[PDB]
């Protein structure tokens, strides 16, 4: 697979370094000369180009890339003009980083295959950890069930699994323990909060 | 639990909106008047202040907040000077949003309780989804064992759980399966996996990768 | 009929002044303070607002306007964001001034009812006048047939065999409408190729 | 001894010229092309570089220098990220020119071996000369003891050393007398004090104030 | 004694904070609104005025000040036009902070009473500390004689004053010893010197250098 990442910011620069670490052909495009020089070593091909121009986009052979990631999320004009061109060039998969709710609505009309909010998805994830310090990481299977990696408190010390009645009393299934030790649990959103309060 | 969020960007503004939804007293501090007027309705109180000033920081009653989040990740001077003042004010928890690796090193020195890379962590998470399109959302329990929410392929249709030897060969456990928008926790042998449905699995990282090829 | 004109430039300010002359209520919105003060006298209601904000758009009572004209044609971000709000606010008629081909393609996606190129339409109209210095002003009824207002050069109507030889009809003589044989700006209606032959031979 | 001076301002450019005058190997680093061309004659080697970037720091050959002076004192971000790289490069002695009190607090955290306030230390010395027109130059041995180079008034003219009972009444010992451009180290009783000759007098900080007032 | 400080920089702001600490009436004039608000508490009278204007300078009542310090050292146009006005208004004492050699020459022509180089005089003083790590502070009595506040080494540990033939061989006099936060004036034979204590010495400039190499 060949990937193109347009815009080497904090978000796009992470995708170039990660996909290059896994051993993939990454094209790194950025309008900034100093950004491309820094990520020149972290990409298979790095070009100092403006992606809002169709002539520059055809010069890169952008039609040969199955996945194009437009990591521009502070310039709505540059981001929407780029993903309109890539939809014109018949790119199978265009993934765009959005800025606000209105930028999400423009890109949904002009044909973005997946629209990503990196700071909004992390900020909600961080604020869940701020509100309840017991949690460390979670994944939402649905809107009401989650796999919350809880942190064992002082009252859970020296307590066996059979002593815990999470299976029946709370209806929560413990998955793993990482030796205060990390306690991975699964259950309803309201049911897990009962186990956090009562230990 | 009273939270102060300094800098209402895409990251700071999301924490103010999320914590206000959960019903928490959030103080929204920003130096830009237009940003403050946007988050007046999404915060308990929104004020205009330059957090690099100690006199302006004490005019907010910032010593009364258990958590302060400095969500400035494009100005290193503004971000590092702010957490220095909060470190002096004996704030128990200071969480800072970092910009690069060398910005993370400054905050570690001057006493940031937690340092957050929002785009770097999401960019790494996205890049796993580009590389392996089977996955939908993964959470790393450790460096070798992870929970991967997989998407069922075309050959997984009309297949039973006992047919898939995940417990025996791959050494992985299917923790949940969802079909048609309804999620079933801890499926029992045997259940029908459909053409396009999410398949949550748990196991070693290299063991799931072998299973995705043969799924 | 209540009209809203968003963006007081050369194009938007001309729509405000013409509609205020005709006796219509016009709301003039612009982000520039100097523009609004100049067109405060030429608009029924004038405000200094950013039209890309949904809160500022609702303060104007923009839902009461049947026609909104987004005459922003150099800021693509301001033009595309504004028409998405007005589409969200259910304006029956949104007319947008575009900049280039790609700006036109964006506004077609997000639901612009009519997209206007003022400089491109005039530039095509002007460039037809430079190549053929006899013409003055023309409109295209169709691709093949057009009404061309020629300039009279160095004869009776019957002498000008446009009806038989060229297959064209003389429409006016400049003031005297509906000419008839015979009579010694010349308006001629006919096929586009036929008028060019008439100009070369006459 | 090898020295590197990062930032050729009024303060950094003075260290380059004084160390080169003494015959030391000075590397002059700056980001401005005009500054580097100006100090080509006053430094062993002058390089155009941006010190906040670590790749440009290792090209200079910065690990070969025992002393590095970061004489940037108007950009807090550029100064603190430079001394972070040098501290990470195991540079033994890093001397940093600071700007304000909060900049001093950051450099203390991230490992600056010595933090310098050139204008603040000179402003304090000047304000002692404005407040007291008798003094010319002083050195604080401690917070209560000092050596003050006084200036002779009219009442000290034609006065011998033994006539002045400074040793008993004030408890201050006269160290030297700058006689008409010629010094006199440890003057012996008695030497005639002229109209205007410097009187290097050592004593308590409060006691010399009495000597200035009582003449 | 009323002092006017024109330009509240790092150097001008240090004179305001020190003259007010000593109990003097200070007029703090600056063209920047942010600077005046910060120093409004540390100055008797703080004004946001431009000093290059003759009308604004007479609104301050600047003729009532014996000392005016023009602490603008990065703006030659503002510094030379200010002191041209103050000399035109017959200020008895005008002290100007200069930038380079050419600014020093202009201010001499247009009648500056004392011209100050804060960063240049510190850079020369700092470069002496980099060259010789034994010195901590020194005061130049002349171009050939100096008082150096040395630092004790391992070879100077447990050595009495009479053991050091500084009076006979080196021709230098030991003035005081800073014994770990305690300072003793005019030591008598004999006093023991610890491992690391400041040793204030006086002598010829070349004779002190021979002492450090030979002891
Ligand atoms: N037209 C363009 N074509 C290509 N790259 C561009 C273009 N416009 C901007 N960029 C580059 O894209 C990069 C990321 O965009 P930008 O800084 O606007 O986004 P952002 O919202 O700040 O994202 P991040 O949080 O990842 O930094 C920048 O380095 C910028 O120079
Ligand atoms: N000194 C300051 N005090 C308070 N708020 C500030 C200060 N400096 C910047 N801000 C605000 O912080 C917010 C976010 O800062 P900035 O835009 O520099 O960071 P970012 O990392 O690019 O943003 P984001 O969180 O959107 O990714 C902005 O609204 C900005 O106005
Ligand atoms: N967000 C906005 N909301 C309202 N008015 C705006 C906005 N952005 C720009 N304007 C105003 O719209 C007017 C026209 O926009 P602009 O000058 O960018 O377009 P243009 O193509 O040059 O227009 P014209 O050819 O009519 O002069 C200007 O007066 C500008 O100040
Ligand atoms: N990142 C950098 N790397 C190297 N040199 C730099 C860098 N940033 C600034 N400089 C240079 O450092 C020199 C001094 O810095 P600056 O002028 O900001 O400090 P300052 O406190 O005003 O100094 P001074 O008052 O002694 O002149 C300038 O010549 C400037 O060009
Ligand atoms: N014409 C003026 N009148 C009054 N104040 C002025 C004028 N011009 C500049 N200043 C102020 O004087 C102060 C010092 O000026 P400047 O920054 O040019 O000098 P500097 O040599 O860099 O100062 P320092 O090294 O002491 O920080 C600043 O606060 C500046 O705003
Ligand atoms: Na961002
Ligand atoms: Na135009
Ligand atoms: Na300075």
From Swiss-Prot, chain C:
GO terms for cellular component: plasma membrane. Residues 1-116 form the RCK N-terminal domain. Keywords: Cell membrane, Ion transport, Membrane, NAD, Potassium, Potassium transport, Transport. Residues 133-202 form the RCK C-terminal domain. NAD(+) binds at residues 10, 30-32, 50-51, 72-74, 97-99, 103, 119. Disulfide bonds: none annotated. The gene is ktrA. This is Ktr system potassium uptake protein A. GO terms for biological process: potassium ion transport. It is a peripheral membrane protein. InterPro entries: NAD(P)-bd_dom_sf, RCK_C, RCK_C_sf, RCK_N, Trk_Ktr_HKT_K-transport. Catalytic subunit of the KtrAB potassium uptake transporter. The 2 major potassium transporter complexes KtrAB and KtrCD confer resistance to both suddenly imposed and prolonged osmotic stress. It is found in: Cell membrane. Disruption phenotype: Impaired potassium uptake. Homodimer, tetramer (dimer of homodimer) and octamer (tetramer of homodimer). Part of the KtrAB complex formed by an octameric catalytic ring of KtrA and a membrane associated dimer of KtrB forming a potassium channel. GO terms for molecular function: identical protein binding; monoatomic cation transmembrane transporter activity. Belongs to the KtrA potassium transport family. Its main location: membrane.
């Amino acid at each position: 697979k060949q990937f193109a990442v347009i815009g080497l910011g904090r978000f796009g620069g992470s995708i170039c370094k990660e996909l290059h670490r896994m051993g993939h052909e990454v094209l790194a495009v950025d309008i900034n000369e100093e950004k491309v020089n820094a990520y020149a070593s972290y990409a298979t091909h790095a070009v100092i180009a403006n992606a809002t121009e169709e002539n520059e986009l055809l010069s890169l052979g952008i039609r040969n890339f199955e996945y194009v990631i437009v990591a521009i999320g502070a310039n709505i004009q540059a981001s929407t003009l780029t993903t309109l061109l890539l939809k014109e060039l018949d790119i199978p998969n265009i993934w765009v980083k959005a800025q606000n709710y209105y930028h999400h609505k423009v890109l949904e009309k002009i044909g973005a295959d997946r629209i990503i909010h990196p700071e909004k998805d992390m900020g909600v994830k961080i604020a869940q950890s701020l509100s309840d310090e017991n949690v460390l990481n979670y994944i939402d299977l649905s809107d009401e069930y989650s796999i919350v990696e809880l942190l064992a408190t002082r009252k859970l010390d020296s307590k066996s699994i059979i002593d815990l009645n999470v299976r029946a009393k709370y209806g929560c299934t413990i998955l793993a323990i990482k030796h205060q030790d990390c306690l991975v649990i699964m259950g309803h959103k309201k049911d897990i909060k009962r186990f956090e309060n009562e230990g």
